[PDB]
Structure formats: C-alpha cells, structure tokens
Design a binder for this molecule. Structure first.
Ligand SMILES: [Mg+2]
Ligand SMILES: [Mg+2]
Ligand SMILES: [Mg+2]
Ligand SMILES: [Mg+2]
Ligand SMILES: [Mg+2]
Ligand SMILES: [Mg+2]
Ligand SMILES: [Mg+2]
Ligand SMILES: [Mg+2]
Ligand SMILES: [Mg+2]
Ligand SMILES: [Mg+2]
Ligand SMILES: [Mg+2]
Ligand SMILES: [Mg+2]
Ligand SMILES: [Mg+2]
Ligand SMILES: [Mg+2]
Ligand SMILES: [Mg+2]
Ligand SMILES: [Mg+2]
Ligand SMILES: [Mg+2]
Ligand SMILES: [Mg+2]
Ligand SMILES: [Mg+2]
Ligand SMILES: [Mg+2]
Ligand SMILES: [Mg+2]
Ligand SMILES: [Mg+2]
Ligand SMILES: [Mg+2]
Ligand SMILES: [Mg+2]
Ligand SMILES: [Mg+2]
Ligand SMILES: [Mg+2]
Ligand SMILES: [Mg+2]
Ligand SMILES: [Mg+2]
Ligand SMILES: [Mg+2]
Lengths: 87, 65, 104, 271, 70, 117
RNA sequence: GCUUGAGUCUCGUAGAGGGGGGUAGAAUUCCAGGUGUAGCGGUGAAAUGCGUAGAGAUCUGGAGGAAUACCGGUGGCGAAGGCGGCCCCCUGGACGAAGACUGACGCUCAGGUGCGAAAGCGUGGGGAGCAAACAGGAUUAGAUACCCUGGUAGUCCACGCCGUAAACGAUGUCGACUUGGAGGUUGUGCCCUUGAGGCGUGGCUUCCGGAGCUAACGCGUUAAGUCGACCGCCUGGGGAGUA
RNA sequence: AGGAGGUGAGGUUUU
C-alpha cells in the first residue's frame, strides 16, 4: 500500500497520527487493501498465491473486528458504519 | 579471491564489456564462480547483465555467428 | 514518476534522423512532465551477431523519469517503426547521470 | 454470452444461445435500410439451382461500407446491431461531418470508440489503410482482392487473415483456411478480427431454428429411387457404389477447381 | 572453438590445442546428455548422489591421514 | 574441373559412421566419402581407421580440383574426429583453420527416451 | 490495568513467489532452391525403413511449435503441490538495524471452505520434437515385451471437470529448555576497512557427532531428547480400502 | 591426490 495512503488513513482514524497500530487503523488499512485488490482479482483469476494473502488479511480483519466488538461496541459500530461493512 | 567485494560495488552494468569479456570465455559462455572465486550475490547480477548484453548484441551467444 | 532506462538500436542507413528521434521523444517526455538524466549516442558500431543480414547499428541510450503511460506509448512507437531494430527498457531504482563506461 | 437453455420441453434441452447485451434493442437505420426479397434457390428461369433453400423469416438488407473510402475524416461508433443477412454484427459509425454508415464490428469495439480511415490513420482495430503501410505479421479482415472494389475476404463472424510477407507490389497472406495468396499491396484491409467470434458455439436443438433461417430439409440419396439419385434402390439399406453427387461427379476427395488465371496468385493450396 | 593456425606452426600442436579447447568447452558431455532424455526425477537424484559421494570421499581422504598402516 | 585453392572439409561423425565432404567456402560441395561406403560395413565403419581411409579416398577424388589450403569444420562425437584430420594433413593438405560446429540446443526439443538394454 | 506473546507503521534487502502481455538466440522438423553422388540411418550382429524420381552430406531464404545449453551450486522462493532465457504492469510473502503504537487481541481444530504433481474428460484451436495404443523388422521354443523403423490420442494454449501419487523428512501444528564442530546463503552493528581483514548479532539451510532416546537402524538445538494445548489415525495377517 | 570423457552375454526357462 502507498505510504501516503497509509498516512492519510492513520491521520483519519487515529488520534496523534502516529499510533498507527490501533484496531481501527489496522481494520481500515486491511479494508483499503482488500478494496484495492478487488480490481486486481477481477482480472487475474488464477493468482491464488496472492489470494492467500487477501484471505489472511480478511481473517486478521475479522479477528480485529471481533475483538473490538467484544471490548467496545460503540467504536465497532461507528467503524463499520464509516467503512460500509455489514458485520 | 573475489574482486567486486574488494571494489565495493553495489550493482552490475551490462555496458562494462571490458570486464564482461574477462568473466566470459572464448566460446561465449559464463564461467562458474568456482574458477574465478566470485561471490554468488555478484555472480547472479553478472549473469543477468550478460544476458541483457547478449539481447542487445553487445556480447555474442556463441562463436558460430 | 519512476526511473527508466531505454537503449535502442537503429539501422545505419537511417543514422541521419537519430537527432530527430531524440528531439521527438524528449518533447513527448517534457509534455508528459518527465525528466531526462542522461542521453548518449554511441554511434554506428559493430554488432556481435548479425541481425537481419547486417553487422553495424547505431545505439542510443537515455535515462528518463517518465510516467508509466508514455513508456508504453514509446514501446508501441518503437515496435511500429521499422528503422529501429530493437529496444530494451528497464525500471531503475535510482536515476544515474554518471557517464556510460563506453562513451570514452 | 454462451448460455444453455433449460430442458423444460423437448426442443430446448440441447439449445444454446449467444446473448449479447451490448446490441441495440430497437430499430435499425431507415436511410440505410432497403428491400431484400427471398427467391428460394430459383434463377430467372424459375428452376431450382441450389437445393435445401426455401422459406424462413422476412429480412431487411442493411447496407454496409466494404470499401471505406472516407479517408482522413475520423468517426465515432454509436451502437452495435444484429444483421440477419450475415453471421457477424454491424456497428453504426458517425463521421465528423455528419454522415452515418454501417461497418463490420471488430472484436475490440464498443459504443463510443473512435475509428479513422485513410493512409495517415494509426494502427488500431477498425482502421483501414493500404497494406504498404500495414506492418508484417498483423491480422486483418475485409481484405480486398482489387483496389476500390470492396472488402471480400474474412467477412465472417470470427475470421481473420495474417500478413506473412510483402515483396515488391504484392503482399503474401495466410487466410482462415490456411491457404496463401498474393494480393496487390494497394488493397486496403480493416485491422483486427471480427466481433461475434462465439457464433460457432451456437446450436439449434430443433429443425425449427434451422427452418427459421431458410434451410429446407435434406433427403439422402439412399432413401431415394435410382431415377432421382444414383444411390437409390435396394430392398433394405444398400450403398454398394462410390459416393457421388446427383449429377455424376464424385465428391469424396475429387477436386472441382478448373481456374487457370489465378494460379499465379495462389502460392500454396490449403491442407 | 575457432582454432586458427599460425605461420610456421606445426600441425600436432594445433590439433592438441583444438582438442584441449573442445574439452574445456565441454561439447561431448552435452551431446551425450542430449542423446537421451533425463527426467527431472533422475537429474536430481544423480546430482544429489554425486554431491554426497564427493563430500564423503573428501572427508574420508582428509580424515584417513591421521592413522598409519605400516 | 574447376580450380579452387581455399577449401573446406566438413566432417559429420557419429557413433556408427563418419562422412567427409570437401567443398568451397560458399558451401558448394566438390566431393564426399563415407566409411560405410569405403569397404567397411557394420561394426568396421565405426573405427577411426575407416574414417581415415574415407578421408584419403575423398582427397583422391577431389585432387582434380587442385586444392592447396584447407580448413576443417568438425561436427559429431566420433572417434574419427582426430583420424580424419590426421589423414587430411598426411595427404599433403595445409590445415589453415580448425573449427567445431557441433549443434548443442538450448534445451529446445525433447530428446528420444532412454534405451533399456 | 502491563508488555515479554501476537499485531501495526517508518527505512531497505534478496528471492526459478504468482498472474497477464511482449521480445531474442541456439537447436530439431518441413518447404523452395544452389553444389554434388551411392549410399543414408540403425543394431551385439542384422533387417524393416529412407534412396539414381538424385536421398544422405554442404549453403541461402522462408514457415511454424515447444523448451530456454553455461552461469546452475545437498543454492533460492512458496503452506504444500511446485517454480529456471530477457523486458514491462499488477500483486503476495519473508527477513534485517533503529525507532513509534493496541495491550492477550493468543494456539489448535470435527464438520465446512480453498488450493492441490502427473495422467484422464468436454468445448474451441494449435501441433516442431517425443511418445501410450497400433503396424512392420529383428531376438527367442514361443515374445501381444526388452532393440530398431514409423506413428495416432497425448504433450501445448483458453475456459471448466476429476481431487488422485513412494502428494516422503514414510517424522501433524504452535510454544519453552538442554553440551558442540564444520560450512552455504541472505542482512546488520563496530574496530586504524588501514587490499579479499578481526569481533559480535539475527533468519533459513547441508553434514558429522556428545548426554539423552530408540527393538535396532538411527534421531540428535531444524529431535525420533526434556514438557504443555489441540486435531487426525491404528488394535493379527488375508478377505479389502473390496461387496 | 582433485576435476572431465566413456565403459559390462544382446537375450536364454524350470526343478
Ligand atoms: Mg427505404
Ligand atoms: Mg436474390
Ligand atoms: Mg444444403
Ligand atoms: Mg441468409
Ligand atoms: Mg444434414
Ligand atoms: Mg420424375
Ligand atoms: Mg443412375
Ligand atoms: Mg418392397
Ligand atoms: Mg439386406
Ligand atoms: Mg454387400
Ligand atoms: Mg535411437
Ligand atoms: Mg518470478
Ligand atoms: Mg513485494
Ligand atoms: Mg477437515
Ligand atoms: Mg495434464
Ligand atoms: Mg483435451
Ligand atoms: Mg518406439
Ligand atoms: Mg507386433
Ligand atoms: Mg491417499
Ligand atoms: Mg523428496
Ligand atoms: Mg502418508
Ligand atoms: Mg491452522
Ligand atoms: Mg519445536
Ligand atoms: Mg524455505
Ligand atoms: Mg547425526
Ligand atoms: Mg520411536
Ligand atoms: Mg482382521
Ligand atoms: Mg471403493
Ligand atoms: Mg513349468
């Protein structure tokens, strides 16, 4: 992912624009990467070697979302509403 | 008995024919690293540059043509 | 931007238009807001193996800071042009302006 | 685009359709439309000359520019349409001045693309220019045997012709049948393949889809009588003779070409 | 392996130089390899067997010098 | 009957035969000889002696062309690789160049399978 | 509540990692020709076969397919299967020195899902070489084989299906600890680098061996040693991984 | 002592 894009996401989701390790920041980065690779996997359908990384990112995002939902539901709902997710 | 390590170079350029002709033989092949004492990290770059030079006709493939 | 290096050969009979080719290419690059860091014409030199039944060709080397689209456009132009024998483009990590070890 | 139908009734189990959603679901261009009446294989004397032809569905002849003589003027494609008179589809093309024409639709063409004819045009699919400027190894269609006459070669749904060599004023081609031929280098040729390359995957599933196009049933010679066909006769099934067309000429492997003014142009027969 | 004789150069010397150049280039080995088809299965097994035999023989030669036999 | 001085000797050797061809520099062959045709047949044509006999016969056949300086182009892993050149040198020819033109492909085509004798 | 597990970011490294698109050469085959004649090829020895209709040999031009000689190395990458000419685009993963942040977010996994050598199937192409099936010639008491002469499907491409291998390290995944020696590869921190040098710190990997374990062979800091969590599997050989 | 090139009845059963 682009360094400028990562910096923009960190500034948008974090507090001091330097934590860059919060659950919301990680989920946003994973979602952005998945959405960017959506167009890559819509053409190269025989790229399972890179699709495994996408699946790993999906699993990591799901685990982070479950942890956020278990810890603070208020932040989880706001994050999913902002990112357009459904669960 | 390596030479690029002593020279402290970072990359290899295919345009250095004066030194590519030393690492290639008369038949046009690339000698193994065990004869010249070359390190593998620079040998891979040497082979990659020699192939590009052969593509660009700076160096030949064999002595037939 | 992204650093590229382009080395292309041209027929000896068409060695009077190498400056025109260079001018057109650099005009396109400047219109695309690219940068040129090195430009050399090696001359009508001998080849290692014959290509299309000839033994001499004139080489041109150019290091560019051109974007992606114009590089592909120049590749298509080289492919369409019959005067140029072949061309090689390589994505370089850093632009270099040191003189070629064969310009001497 | 290739979709199999459901076996809801006998007659759709083996039916496969080629559905293209990019076509024009409307009416064609009336100024380019004209009348085309069916005959049925009968010439001016009223006797059948080509069998298995008769009936079908009423059609209209969409005129199409096979010459592409509008040199220099660029143009824009508007929409794709279905032509019952040929396997391929048609593209409506509007020039800058305002003239509208019908052209054959290449593979890589969509509504909104730009085409340009003439020698000065660039190398992109749909463009037309003489082969003297076309490079070697390219695939073309609407090849013309004589300059200015009009495209005649590779006008089908998915055919193309490769340009193998160009010596002097002649250009060597490789046709869709594998045959080589010499064509005058001044003959224009549209670039790229043709659109409906998936037209050969379509099947009919019933005799109705074949008779809708004007193909009458075919009767084999063995089922006929010796008067009607040489294969007629026999208490049961008998074919004790070499296969022969109804007019005495053998068909299995016998050559039927007797042209001598085109052997100079022909270089290698198809195999 | 273009071998060109020189002025007043004998024939046996030129023939021996040509043979040595051919042996160094290694064309007989290549043509003998290409006479048949070696499966990747066989090539890997042969390479590993040769490497382990070389390593074992060098180790034995090095370690057999510490004991006498006379 | 034409007179040419600078000649070429192409040698095509194998594990079963050896062919010698005397030609010009442009490729137009002048004469040829083979061990199988030079009396020896079967297992006797694989010996280098048969190759040198064939070379001598080829030299005697091309002597009418009047060739003085000769180059050699060898191709094929055969025992006659040296015997043919020795015979050519002993036949009074002048060996001005020796070259090997053995074709070794760059893993182009699959070779035939291995023999299970 | 905490950072020691895990994870994120800044800076770089190597890599036949994956997909798509192009390009270059060697070589085999074929075609059109030039020189030139009696053999070529093959086998243990022969023969079938190819050849005076000019073969095979040598030169030029062209056509098309597949794979990329050396480098290439118990070398590298990937979860496995598996990946090798060169160039471009997209993309995954690992590691290394400094830093910044969440504060167990951690491990395993029945069912389930995905990938998955080669062979095989369908659709549409292509088909240079090799080659099952097949034909002929040999050996043999017989040879439906081993050898030779030809050669189809296949091998290749695009989309799907099958989901099988001695798919092996015959060793399930993750974690903590326990004497070592030779190297290889890939980074980094210092010391007059004072020329390829010396010391230390990480990752992966090859070999030999100590205690220990094992029926033995052998494993042996990358365990088959010392322990925890989870899953899968076996309970005599045949029948049978069959009905 | 290190590296490279090959290399064996062509087949011939049972007890
Ligand atoms: Mg009207
Ligand atoms: Mg009519
Ligand atoms: Mg009919
Ligand atoms: Mg019709
Ligand atoms: Mg019919
Ligand atoms: Mg009647
Ligand atoms: Mg009759
Ligand atoms: Mg009756
Ligand atoms: Mg009957
Ligand atoms: Mg009968
Ligand atoms: Mg053989
Ligand atoms: Mg790769
Ligand atoms: Mg990367
Ligand atoms: Mg399961
Ligand atoms: Mg397969
Ligand atoms: Mg198939
Ligand atoms: Mg066979
Ligand atoms: Mg038989
Ligand atoms: Mg199994
Ligand atoms: Mg293994
Ligand atoms: Mg198992
Ligand atoms: Mg797991
Ligand atoms: Mg462990
Ligand atoms: Mg690994
Ligand atoms: Mg051990
Ligand atoms: Mg045990
Ligand atoms: Mg039991
Ligand atoms: Mg079963
Ligand atoms: Mg018995």
């Amino acid at each position: 992912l682009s360094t400028e894009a990562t910096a923009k996401i960190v500034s948008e989701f974090g507090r001091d624009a330097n934590d860059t390790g919060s659950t919301e920041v990680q989920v946003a980065l994973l979602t952005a990467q998945i959405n960017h690779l959506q167009g890559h996997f819509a053409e190269h359908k025989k790229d399972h070697h890179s699709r495994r990384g996408l699946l790993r990112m999906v699993s990591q995002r799901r685990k982070l979302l479950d942890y956020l939902k278990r810890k603070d539901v208020a932040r989880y709902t706001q994050l999913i509403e902002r990112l357009g997710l459904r669960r | 008995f390596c030479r690029f390590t002593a020279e402290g170079v970072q990359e290899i350029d295919y345009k250095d024919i004066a030194t590519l002709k030393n690492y290639i033989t008369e038949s046009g092949k690339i000698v193994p690293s065990r004869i010249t004492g070359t390190r593998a990290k620079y040998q891979r770059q040497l082979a990659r540059a020699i192939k590009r030079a052969r593509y660009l006709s700076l160096l030949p493939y064999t002595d037939r043509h | 931007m992204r650093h590229y290096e382009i080395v292309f050969m041209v027929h000896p009979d068409q060695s009077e238009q190498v400056p025109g080719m260079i001018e057109r290419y650099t005009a396109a690059i400047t219109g695309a807001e690219g940068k040129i860091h090195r430009l050399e014409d090696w001359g009508r030199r001998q080849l290692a193996y014959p290509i299309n039944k000839l033994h001499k060709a004139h080489y041109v080397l150019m290091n560019v800071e051109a974007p992606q689209e114009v590089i592909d456009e120049l590749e298509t132009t080289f492919r369409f042009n019959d005067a140029v024998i072949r061309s090689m483009v390589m994505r370089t990590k850093h632009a270099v302006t040191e003189a070629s070890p064969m310009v001497k | 685009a290739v979709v199999k139908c459901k076996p809801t009734s006998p007659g759709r189990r083996h039916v496969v359709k080629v559905v293209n959603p990019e076509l024009h679901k409307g009416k064609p261009f009336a100024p380019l439309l004209e009348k085309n009446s069916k005959s049925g294989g009968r010439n001016n004397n009223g006797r059948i000359t080509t069998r298995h032809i008769g009936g079908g569905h009423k059609q209209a002849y969409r005129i199409v520019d096979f010459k592409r003589n509008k040199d220099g003027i660029p143009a824009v494609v508007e929409r794709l349409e279905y032509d019952p008179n040929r396997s391929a589809n048609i593209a409506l093309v509007l020039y800058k001045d305002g003239e509208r024409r019908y052209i054959l639709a290449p593979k890589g063409l969509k509504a909104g693309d730009q085409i340009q004819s003439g020698v000065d045009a660039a190398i992109k699919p749909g463009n037309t220019l003489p082969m003297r400027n076309i490079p070697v190894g390219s695939t073309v269609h609407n090849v013309e045997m004589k300059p200015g006459k009009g495209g005649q070669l590779a006008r089908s749904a998915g055919t193309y012709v490769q340009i193998v060599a160009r010596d002097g004023a002649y250009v060597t081609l490789r046709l869709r049948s594998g045959e080589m031929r010499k064509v005058e280098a001044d003959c224009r040729a549209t670039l790229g393949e043709v659109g409906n390359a998936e037209h050969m995957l379509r099947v009919l599933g019933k005799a109705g889809a074949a008779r809708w196009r004007g193909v009458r049933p075919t009767v084999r010679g063995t089922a006929m009588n010796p008067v009607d066909h040489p294969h007629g006769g026999g208490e049961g099934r008998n074919f004790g003779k070499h296969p022969v067309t109804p007019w005495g000429v053998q068909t299995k492997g016998k050559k039927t070409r007797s042209n001598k003014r085109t052997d100079k142009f022909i270089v290698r027969r198809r195999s | 392996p273009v071998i060109k004789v020189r002025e007043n150069e004998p024939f046996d010397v030129a023939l021996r130089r040509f043979k040595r150049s051919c042996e160094k280039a290694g064309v007989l080995a290549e043509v003998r390899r290409r006479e048949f088809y070696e499966k990747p299965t066989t090539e890997r097994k042969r390479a590993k067997a040769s490497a382990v035999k070389r390593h074992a023989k060098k180790l034995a030669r090095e370690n057999a010098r510490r004991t006498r036999l006379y | 009957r034409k007179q040419v001085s600078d000649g070429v000797a192409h040698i095509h050797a194998s594990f079963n035969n050896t062919i010698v061809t005397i030609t010009d520099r442009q490729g137009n062959a002048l004469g040829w000889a083979t061990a199988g045709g030079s009396g020896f047949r079967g297992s006797r044509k694989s010996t280098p002696f048969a190759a040198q006999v064939a070379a001598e016969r080829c030299a005697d056949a091309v002597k009418e062309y009047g060739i003085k300086n000769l180059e050699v182009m060898v191709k094929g892993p055969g025992p006659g690789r040296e015997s043919t050149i020795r015979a050519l040198n002993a036949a009074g020819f002048r060996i001005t160049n020796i070259t090997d033109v053995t074709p070794i492909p760059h893993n182009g085509c699959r070779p035939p399978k291995k023999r299970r004798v």
